[PDB]
Amino acid sequence: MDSTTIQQNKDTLSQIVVFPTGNYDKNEANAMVNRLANIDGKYLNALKQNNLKIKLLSGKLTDEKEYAYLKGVVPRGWEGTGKTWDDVPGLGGSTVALRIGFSNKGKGHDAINLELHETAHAIDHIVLNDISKSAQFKQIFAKEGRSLGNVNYLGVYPEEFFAESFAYYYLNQDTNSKLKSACPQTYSFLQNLAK
Ligand SMILES: [Zn+2]
Numbered sequence: 001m002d003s004t005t006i007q008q009n010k011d012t013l014s015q016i017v018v019f020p021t022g023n024y025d026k027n028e029a030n031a032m033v034n035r036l037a038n039i040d041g042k043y044l045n046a047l048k049q050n051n052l053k054i055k056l057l058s059g060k061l062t063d064e065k066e067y068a069y070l071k072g073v074v075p076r077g078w079e080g081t082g083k084t085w086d087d088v089p090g091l092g093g094s095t096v097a098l099r100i101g102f103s104n105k106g107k108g109h110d111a112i113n114l115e116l117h118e119t120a121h122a123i124d125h126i127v128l129n130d131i132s133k134s135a136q137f138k139q140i141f142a143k144e145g146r147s148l149g150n151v152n153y154l155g156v157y158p159e160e161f162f163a164e165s166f167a168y169y170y171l172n173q174d175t176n177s178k179l180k181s182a183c184p185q186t187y188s189f190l191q192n193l194a195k
Helices: 003-013 026-036 041-049 065-070 114-127 135-144 158-171 173-182 184-193
Strands: 054-057 090-092 096-099
Touching: 003 026, 003 041, 026 054, 026 114, 041 114, 054 114, 090 114, 096 114, 114 158, 135 158, 135 184, 158 173, 158 184, 173 184
Parallel strands: 054 096
Antiparallel strands: 090 096
């Protein structure tokens, strides 16, 4: 978007994003906020209204006290991988927590972008009343839910296809155009949702 809208959304994010105590790459943390600032301001203002916080983490997720209960827990589908929640860089839903530096695909996660995927979960659940489970989205998901790949994950859980599609829509113009070409109904759905 234009530089002015980005600055306005960053001002909104200043009352949403919470930075960690420990040491971390300040420039990369700022880059994560810049990418979050591409999300439509209506969604950001709604997260602010519900007092949702986006906690950026300087270390492992499970080294935060509020998530210490996840230490040693094996995520769904990760059995036999030798990996646990200790290795998970982000989560989204009723809360959002994101490890600084793990934005890009493959940094311990399969999303096109960590912060947009997880924040999409929170928007889905807190702002949009679990719209990813709506009848309208289910029909779209049945047709297009496999077209971003990861067929046995994104294609099985509409909440994950929604979050990944949301991330594609708002990350950059390239992922936005790829979404329109691969998932035209999902693209139009997200386009109207922001109107
Ligand atoms: Zn997810």
